[PDB]
């Protein structure tokens, strides 16, 4: 479970408000939030690696309460 997939975001969000955002729950050890080079903008889906698995299963339970730019945030195991 150490990693999660996160959908439905707005590009003003970046890797930092994800950092800050999910460490509110529990620390994101490895952050991945693609920067698209071609048009220089984000599609808004994320992958998160944690310290171990327990962090991330609690993360499955609590985790999908985040709302990025008035809008819904997908978090599921991976």
């Amino acid at each position: 479970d150490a990693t999660v997939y996160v959908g439905g975001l707005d590009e003003k969000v970046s890797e930092p408000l994800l950092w800050e955002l999910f460490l509110q729950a529990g620390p994101v050890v490895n952050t991945h939030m693609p920067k698209d080079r071609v048009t220089g903008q984000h599609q808004g889906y994320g992958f998160v690696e944690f310290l171990s698995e327990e962090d991330a299963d609690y993360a499955i339970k609590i985790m999908n309460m985040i709302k990025l730019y008035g809008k819904p945030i997908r978090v599921n195991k991976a």
Partner: protein
């Protein structure tokens, strides 16, 4: 004890069992069908369902999925029917109490376990859905009844008997297939065209062992049919019929191994000292021979099936035979119900052998990595679940032992009684003397 209640519980349990084996017969009609078909060829009277039903594996309108499991459930139903027969047996063999029922009124207990523990004690399917076997027969295992070469009744292993047979004929001119050709002999051939002389010792012994095997195999592969019924049927056929062998030329044969002109001399020969001697010495063997005969007849389909198998395996190559064996094996041991930087790593200090003792005596290839083990999910699980709380304090030592004494290293007022002696007296103690005072 009011017998009414006991007899009641009995009829109820019987009902429960009938319902269970009926639910089974429902999910997979084959269970009955299979059984019934065999029964058909033992007790000719038996009425059997429409062929269409059998094929489509349906009982009324719905065609059920085709299913080791069939046999399993058949043995389970076997033990169920045993229970039922027992209960049926024992069964064949007011204010006063309501007052005593008032006994021990004050118990805070929920009681939902009489029909539920029984219904449950006899139903399909672990936590949820892993093992089809009921709690009733949870330790029932077919592999302790069938060998791998028998494939739960598909084949019967006769290689062993081919060995013993070679030992019996004192040669090697006999091949597995020629041996099976010999077995085929078994209403008149096994009697009038015997492989060996039927008065030979080795031969009679062999025949005994083989007969026993075939019979046990028979009833083993068809649990659902009443074994005692079959046994008695055969025995009565043996006694009542078996001058059963008659020839228009030689007359009547006797299993004395001689013929007889007419029935008259045949009867007056059944009292003679000769026949008395023989029937008194070779009785068990004759009877066993007969059983081998009738049981092999009832298993003609299995005999053929195996002979076929033999020829196949025989005509295989090496790889083929190997893969086939693999298949038989898998079928045997399967659940009855399915669910470059070389100097870089030295410089950085990695790929160097190291071990953490508290974690599964685990191995770590780098010192930076092991230093990262100190803050981890699993490492903290071992600590905290071990009873050693997770904090930096312990972020050094690996061995389970030392941190136990470290955690032991990790983990009183005076209320003045009135006699001026209670300056040694504790708060709670003086409160207790408040309740006493």
């Amino acid at each position: 004890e009011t017998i009414l209640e006991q007899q009641r519980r009995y009829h109820e349990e019987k009902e429960r069992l009938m319902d269970v084996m009926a639910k089974e017969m429902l999910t997979k009609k084959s269970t009955l069908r299979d059984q019934i078909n065999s029964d058909h060829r033992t007790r000719a009277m038996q009425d059997r369902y429409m062929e269409v039903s059998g094929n489509l594996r349906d009982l009324y309108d719905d065609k059920d999925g085709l299913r080791a499991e069939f046999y399993n459930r058949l043995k389970q139903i076997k033990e169920f029917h045993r229970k039922h027969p027992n209960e049926i047996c024992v069964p064949m063999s007011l204010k006063a109490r309501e007052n005593p029922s008032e006994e021990a009124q004050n118990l805070v207990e929920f009681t939902d376990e009489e029909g539920y523990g029984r219904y449950l004690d006899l139903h399909d399917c672990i936590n949820l859905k892993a093992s089809e076997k009921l709690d009733y027969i949870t330790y029932l295992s077919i592999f302790d009844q069938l060998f791998d070469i028998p494939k739960e009744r598909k084949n019967a292993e006769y290689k062993r008997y081919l060995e013993m047979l070679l030992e019996y004929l004192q040669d090697y001119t006999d091949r597995v297939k020629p041996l099976q050709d010999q077995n085929e002999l078994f209403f008149e051939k096994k009697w009038e065209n015997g492989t060996f002389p039927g008065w030979p010792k080795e031969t009679s012994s062999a025949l005994t062992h083989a007969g026993a095997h075939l019979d046990l195999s028979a009833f083993s592969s068809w649990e659902e049919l009443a074994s005692l019924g079959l046994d008695r049927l055969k025995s009565a056929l043996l006694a009542l019929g078996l001058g059963t062998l008659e020839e228009r030329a030689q007359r009547l044969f006797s299993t004395k191994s001689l013929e007889s002109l007419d029935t008259s001399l045949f009867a007056k020969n059944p009292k003679s000292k000769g026949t008395k001697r023989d029937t008194e010495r070779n009785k068990d063997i004759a009877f066993l021979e007969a059983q081998i005969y009738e049981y092999v007849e009832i298993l003609g389909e299995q005999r053929h099936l195996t002979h076929e198998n033999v020829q196949r395996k025989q005509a295989r190559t090496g790889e083929e035979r190997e893969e086939e064996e693999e298949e038989q094996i898998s079928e045997s041991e399967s659940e009855d119900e399915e669910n470059i930087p070389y100097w870089l790593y030295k410089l950085h200090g990695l790929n160097i052998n190291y071990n953490c003792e508290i974690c599964g005596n685990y191995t770590y290839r780098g010192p930076k990595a092991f230093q990262r083990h100190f803050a981890e999910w699993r490492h903290a699980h071992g600590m905290r679940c071990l009873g050693i709380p997770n904090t930096a304090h312990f972020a050094n030592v690996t061995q389970i032992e030392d941190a136990v004494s470290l955690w032991a290293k990790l983990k009183d007022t005076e209320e003045e009684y009135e006699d001026s002696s209670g300056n040694v007296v504790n708060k709670k103690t003086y409160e207790d003397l408040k309740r006493q005072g």
